[PDB]
Symmetry: C2
Subunit: 86 residues, 2 copies
């Protein structure tokens, strides 16, 4: 699974953790909502609430996020939006 | 252009305004982040900030929404997530 970061406003480290955590979600689950749940809850646990997650092969977004708490990236062909609301 | 509501926590009036507004978005724009931006900003403007909108043909989501400010719906073949964070 090729990891490609499209837009991030978060630390080099937290980004890597987003990828690691999605990688886990993609081995466990096939359904986007379930994959999405996995990442949100994991990121709520490790970096405090509140996170929102979007997983899909085809979406665009427009959200207002907290500074340093935003990432949009692809893992394989599945795109991932994870952010904290601003 | 077929409206199908999948999950909603908002009033049926504001729901209907979400559908009307998305329709206006899809008439004016073809690109998901643009469509999403039009909807989010119209809802910030009409119902006060902060809103977030996701638009696409394939995605799933797991978000923490504010009570009465959440809809997930299809419009024709596009799915639209529109919410305020909890």
């Amino acid at each position: 699974r090729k990891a490609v970061i499209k837009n991030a406003d978060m630390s080099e480290e937290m980004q890597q953790d987003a990828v690691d955590c999605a990688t886990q979600a993609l081995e466990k689950y096939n359904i986007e909502k379930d994959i999405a749940a996995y990442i949100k809850k994991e990121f709520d646990k490790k970096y405090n609430p509140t996170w929102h997650c979007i997983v899909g092969r085809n979406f665009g977004s427009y959200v207002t996020h907290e500074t340093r708490h935003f990432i949009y990236f692809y893992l394989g062909q599945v795109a991932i939006l994870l952010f904290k609301s601003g």
